[PDB]
Amino acid sequence: MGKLSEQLKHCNGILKELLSKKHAAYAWPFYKPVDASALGLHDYHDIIKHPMDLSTVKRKMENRDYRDAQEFAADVRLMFSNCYKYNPPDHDVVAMARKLQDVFEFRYAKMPD
Ligand SMILES: COc1cc2c(cc1OC)[C@@H](C)C(=O)N(C)CC2
């Protein structure tokens, strides 16, 4: 239980919060991979080269894929960046991304040193 383990516990706590009922009203678009075909978004995978979502982050955390907090944060921010790249900035889904990213960034900032 070095610094990396302690920081990954903080990351796991954040992940649990992002998936919690407290944030469900704006977190739900990020729960599962974007289903482009189901949504009729036939340009999604031409625009987004590296899809990411909270179920994928959860699988990677469960599989001990993340070696440090920075690697975890990069996936969570990739998920938000994909949303900001693909969707017009006035769309409800972007408002929901902004709100969940505020939750993420303020708690990520409280990382134990
Ligand atoms: C609320 O409407 C939308 C939901 C979703 C998306 C887009 C939506 O509005 C167009 C896709 C493209 C997206 O970025 N995520 C993150 C998944 C779901």
From Swiss-Prot:
Bromo domain ranges (all copies): 2-111
Effect noted on mutating residue 87 to A: Abolished binding to histone H4 acetylated at 'Lys-12' (H4K12ac)
Domain of life: Eukaryota
Effect of residue 41 to A: Reduced binding to histone H4 acetylated at 'Lys-12' (H4K12ac)
Location within or outside the cell: Nucleus; Chromosome
Family membership noted in the UniProt record: Belongs to the BET family.
Domain comment in the entry: The first bromo domain specifically recognizes histone H4 acetylated at 'Lys-12' (H4K12ac). It also specifically binds histone H4 acetyl-methylated at 'Lys-5' and 'Lys-12' (H4K5acme and H4K12acme, respectively). The second bromo domain recognizes and binds histone H4 acetylated at 'Lys-5' and 'Lys-12' (H4K5ac and H4K12ac, respectively).
Complexes and interactors: Homodimer. Interacts with E2F1. Interacts with (acetylated) STAT3; promoting STAT3 recruitment to chromatin. Interacts with CTCF; promoting BRD2 recruitment to chromatin. (Microbial infection) Interacts with herpes virus 8 protein LANA1.
Misc remark: Some specific inhibitors of BRD2 that prevent binding to acetylated histone are promising therapeutic molecules for the treatment of cancers or inflammatory diseases. ABBV-744, a small molecule, has been tested on tumors with success: ABBV-744 antiproliferative activity is mainly restricted to cell lines of acute myeloid leukaemia and prostate cancer and is able to displace BRD4 from chromatin. GSK046 (iBET-BD2), which specifically inhibits the second bromo domain, is a promising therapeutic small molecule for the treatment of inflammatory and autoimmune diseases.
Function, in words: Chromatin reader protein that specifically recognizes and binds histone H4 acetylated at 'Lys-5' and 'Lys-12' (H4K5ac and H4K12ac, respectively), thereby controlling gene expression and remodeling chromatin structures. Recruits transcription factors and coactivators to target gene sites, and activates RNA polymerase II machinery for transcriptional elongation.
Protein name per UniProt: Bromodomain-containing protein 2
Organism annotation: Homo sapiens
Part of the whole protein covered: 344 to 455 of 801
